[PDB]
Amino acid sequence: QCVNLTTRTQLPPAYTNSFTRGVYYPDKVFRSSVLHSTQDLFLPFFSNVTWFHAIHVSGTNGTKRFDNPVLPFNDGVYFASTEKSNIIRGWIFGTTLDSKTQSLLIVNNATNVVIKVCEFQFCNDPFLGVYYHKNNKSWMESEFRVYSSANNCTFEYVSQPFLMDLEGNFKNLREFVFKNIDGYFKIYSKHTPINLVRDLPQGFSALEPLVDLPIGINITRFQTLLALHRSYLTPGDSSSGWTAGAAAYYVGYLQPRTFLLKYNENGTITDAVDCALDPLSETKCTLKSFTVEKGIYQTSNFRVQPTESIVRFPNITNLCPFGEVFNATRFASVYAWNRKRISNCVADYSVLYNSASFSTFKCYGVSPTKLNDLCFTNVYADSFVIRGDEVRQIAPGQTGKIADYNYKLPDDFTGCVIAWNSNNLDSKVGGNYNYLYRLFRKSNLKPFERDISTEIYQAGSTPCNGVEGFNCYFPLQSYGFQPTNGVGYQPYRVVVLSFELLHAPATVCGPKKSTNLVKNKCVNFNFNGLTGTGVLTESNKKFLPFQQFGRDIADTTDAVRDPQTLEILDITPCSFGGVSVITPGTNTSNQVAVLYQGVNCTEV
Amino acid sequence: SNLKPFERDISTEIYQAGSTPCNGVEGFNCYFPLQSYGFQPTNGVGYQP
Amino acid sequence: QVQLQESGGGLVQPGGSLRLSCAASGFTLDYYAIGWFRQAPGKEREGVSCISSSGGRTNYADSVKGRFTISRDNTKNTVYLQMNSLKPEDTAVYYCAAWEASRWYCPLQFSADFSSWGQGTQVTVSS
Ligand SMILES: *[C@@H]1O[C@H](CO)[C@@H](O)[C@H](O)[C@H]1NC(C)=O
Ligand SMILES: *[C@@H]1O[C@H](CO)[C@@H](O)[C@H](O)[C@H]1NC(C)=O
Ligand SMILES: *[C@@H]1O[C@H](CO)[C@@H](O)[C@H](O)[C@H]1NC(C)=O
Ligand SMILES: *[C@@H]1O[C@H](CO)[C@@H](O)[C@H](O)[C@H]1NC(C)=O
Ligand SMILES: *[C@@H]1O[C@H](CO)[C@@H](O)[C@H](O)[C@H]1NC(C)=O
């Protein structure tokens, strides 16, 4: 069972430098007297590490509290312990650290290690209540107060203790590295004596692999485990703990890096070189040696990276005559369909989509927000006046009088149907009967089939011969379009736009957003389909009115015409190059200089 | 979005089919993600388990 | 993609209660003022109950005063009308509409054109 402590009070972190530690064997192969390069998760040389006291005294009274904040676990963690009296006991790993996500617990008592993977319900302040025996005192007895409950256990492991017994300045380093890759949780370990070094000591010691765990769980945050020998019920004034917590622990975070390790003859990692630390290190990487001779060497290649992209489009008030069709005064009858075509002109579908005046938008095959994105070979506009309840009949694969007897709609549309109410423009008080509808036909119609024949249909067996009578009706009936009529009978103005998407030239395109011109900074540009990278500058050349391109002596294009306002712009790739390191012999000094070939020093 | 290889997602969050947020409640353009099927001995070969 | 969808309609007993809900998809319904309308068999579409954009102004038909209450959730973008003491006179095809105020003044008592219309639900009261 768990027992609650006092608040952590959010103590400010403390930082300290790490001097070339944490190198672990990346693989399981024996290699002798060879320099080998590896790209893997490492701890950078001369990095920041955060340091926590095991027991901290910050209150004026002399309060002793356990510094055990939760810490992020981002892709490997290096844990170093400066310790002398066996106070740390284990670790916990998870995302939520509760009964909601799978959790990992490693503990170490005086006998062995316990590795457990279950759905533990942890308390806010896990610890191990430890005490000595009244006679022997050789070993410490531990009571677990780490979790409340454990369920759904999928792993168990026991082996030799991870922490050697520490039972008066004989401080030692215990260095561990945890990684979690491909569902495998790898622990690399090392133990080392030290003297009179409070921080991480300057030196080098490899990390050998200790254990691999087929856990396969997901880890984001972790917490260390500490042993309370004191009485949480009755805290002493002082000296109940351990000299105000001299023993403590340092945490560092790994990230992907490339190293050069030097295997000696025995196979022991004796030195390593970080590759991106400083230019001399980059030279040692590129030359693949531990020592660099005097001279000049080419190591890397400098290159400016564009930060943004630009796309450009023309500048014309004239466009597709959508306004003249949608806002037209008169619209044809619904059984003699006026079909219009729009071509060789630019379409702005955002005017129609964002108008917030059209009652129905129904696009099939193309999303309505990408209507301006795509280029269509042709667009057919059909604009008529239909009753409200029959607006639903205008869609692929539907039935009804208009759907069947008027105009069949195929099931493979790539186009849009748009409708807006026309009560105040089409209806009159006395009834507008200028739109005629047929209710009887011999058979259902073909897709995109127009019939205007006015022959009187034969409902019975006797022939009509173009004359009404018994079982003989004229095809077209009138609608009572009135401003007082209901929703189903009021007139709605409907336009269908069918887009032709074939392997054919595109005459209808969306200018989209004419991205404002941003020059004198090499950007990713896309002019009328040309995609490239480079800097745009004003140029005094003159293109012919039909010419859109400018070519160098080679195939590389240089100057492009601005569709908005001509003033030809010219393109220049933005200053690539190469970095050289000027250094003397490394046995003299490690100071270096950097030279950037073929570029001045403003973009560096 | 499409998923990473061998990636396990167990979330039961109600997806937002529209622009309005669902906030874990079904409704308009809001649905539970999982659907079940009538695995039956009389179904066609294409629909057999 | 602007859609208004009504729901909750059906058959109820006279003197009973019913609740009707219209939702907006493809656009935000908070900006618009919302009116609930009905059309009875053989009658014209009359104004039942209107609510403002912010919900601070409401208007009711005199036939439904003291029986119907209109409300709105701008967070859930949904407009509700609660019916109490329903009568056979209330059987109608029932629509939700959204529009912006066409006249000066806060009150929504006056009528105008209505921008967006749903398909509606049937409300039948008979026993
Ligand atoms: C490490 O900490 C010091 C201050 O303690 C800070 O100035 C330095 O920039 C940190 N390291 C890096 C790489 O920023
Ligand atoms: C681990 O959990 C976090 C949320 O706590 C999530 O963002 C991440 O995708 C998870 N990783 C895997 C591999 O599921
Ligand atoms: C390590 O190498 C030294 C010489 O450098 C040799 O004397 C010693 O025996 C080697 N030890 C092992 C364990 O290989
Ligand atoms: C097209 O370019 C001219 C350049 O003088 C500009 O004045 C005009 O505003 C541009 N068109 C639009 C719609 O902005
Ligand atoms: C770039 O370097 C050349 C080399 O002399 C220099 O003349 C030119 O002015 C430099 N450009 C800028 C923008 O400083």
Short mmCIF file of C-alpha atoms in Angstrom, two decimals, chain C residues 1-91:
data_model
loop_
_atom_site.label_atom_id
_atom_site.label_comp_id
_atom_site.label_asym_id
_atom_site.label_seq_id
_atom_site.Cartn_x
_atom_site.Cartn_y
_atom_site.Cartn_z
CA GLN C 1 -22.76 21.73 -48.38
CA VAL C 2 -25.14 23.78 -46.24
CA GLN C 3 -27.73 21.41 -44.75
CA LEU C 4 -30.49 21.93 -42.19
CA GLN C 5 -31.84 18.66 -40.79
CA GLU C 6 -34.88 18.35 -38.53
CA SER C 7 -35.62 15.40 -36.26
CA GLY C 8 -37.92 14.21 -33.50
CA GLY C 9 -41.20 14.17 -35.42
CA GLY C 10 -43.87 11.54 -35.05
CA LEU C 11 -47.28 10.76 -33.58
CA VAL C 12 -48.32 11.89 -30.09
CA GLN C 13 -51.48 12.02 -27.97
CA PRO C 14 -53.38 15.30 -27.46
CA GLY C 15 -52.29 16.83 -24.18
CA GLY C 16 -48.92 15.11 -24.49
CA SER C 17 -45.48 16.51 -25.20
CA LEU C 18 -42.92 16.35 -28.00
CA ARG C 19 -39.52 17.90 -28.68
CA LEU C 20 -38.14 18.86 -32.10
CA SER C 21 -34.55 19.57 -33.10
CA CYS C 22 -32.92 21.08 -36.18
CA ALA C 23 -29.16 20.90 -36.74
CA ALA C 24 -26.85 22.64 -39.19
CA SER C 25 -24.09 20.89 -41.14
CA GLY C 26 -21.54 22.58 -43.38
CA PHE C 27 -21.97 25.95 -41.64
CA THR C 28 -22.16 27.50 -38.19
CA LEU C 29 -25.72 28.07 -37.00
CA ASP C 30 -24.90 30.56 -34.22
CA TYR C 31 -24.70 33.59 -36.52
CA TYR C 32 -28.17 33.03 -38.01
CA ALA C 33 -31.59 33.65 -36.50
CA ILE C 34 -33.71 30.49 -36.54
CA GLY C 35 -37.44 30.13 -37.13
CA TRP C 36 -39.62 27.06 -36.68
CA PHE C 37 -42.52 27.00 -39.17
CA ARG C 38 -45.39 24.61 -39.86
CA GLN C 39 -47.77 23.83 -42.72
CA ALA C 40 -51.10 22.22 -41.85
CA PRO C 41 -53.17 20.12 -44.29
CA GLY C 42 -54.99 22.62 -46.47
CA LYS C 43 -53.29 25.63 -44.83
CA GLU C 44 -50.33 27.86 -45.62
CA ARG C 45 -46.94 27.88 -43.89
CA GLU C 46 -47.35 29.99 -40.74
CA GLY C 47 -44.74 31.20 -38.28
CA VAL C 48 -44.57 29.08 -35.13
CA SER C 49 -41.55 30.19 -33.10
CA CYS C 50 -38.49 32.34 -33.81
CA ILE C 51 -35.25 32.79 -31.86
CA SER C 52 -32.41 35.27 -32.37
CA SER C 53 -28.75 34.59 -33.12
CA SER C 54 -27.72 35.03 -29.47
CA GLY C 55 -30.97 33.63 -28.07
CA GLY C 56 -31.80 36.88 -26.27
CA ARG C 57 -34.88 37.63 -28.39
CA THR C 58 -37.77 35.24 -29.04
CA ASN C 59 -41.17 35.43 -30.72
CA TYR C 60 -44.13 33.05 -30.52
CA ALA C 61 -47.39 32.65 -32.40
CA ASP C 62 -50.42 33.49 -30.27
CA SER C 63 -51.83 29.99 -30.84
CA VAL C 64 -48.79 28.38 -29.17
CA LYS C 65 -48.11 30.95 -26.45
CA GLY C 66 -47.82 29.26 -23.07
CA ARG C 67 -47.34 25.85 -24.70
CA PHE C 68 -44.20 25.96 -26.88
CA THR C 69 -40.72 27.01 -25.75
CA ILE C 70 -37.82 27.70 -28.12
CA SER C 71 -34.16 27.32 -27.19
CA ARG C 72 -30.76 27.08 -28.83
CA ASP C 73 -27.30 25.64 -28.18
CA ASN C 74 -24.64 27.60 -30.07
CA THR C 75 -21.93 25.24 -28.81
CA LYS C 76 -23.78 22.19 -30.19
CA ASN C 77 -25.11 24.28 -33.15
CA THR C 78 -28.64 23.01 -32.62
CA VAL C 79 -32.08 24.61 -32.28
CA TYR C 80 -34.81 23.05 -30.15
CA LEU C 81 -38.53 23.60 -29.69
CA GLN C 82 -40.32 21.88 -26.81
CA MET C 83 -44.05 21.24 -27.27
CA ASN C 84 -46.39 20.93 -24.29
CA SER C 85 -50.17 20.54 -24.26
CA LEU C 86 -50.23 19.63 -27.95
CA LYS C 87 -53.55 19.81 -29.79
CA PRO C 88 -54.94 18.27 -32.99
CA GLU C 89 -54.59 21.75 -34.54
CA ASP C 90 -50.79 21.29 -34.34
CA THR C 91 -50.63 18.39 -36.82
#
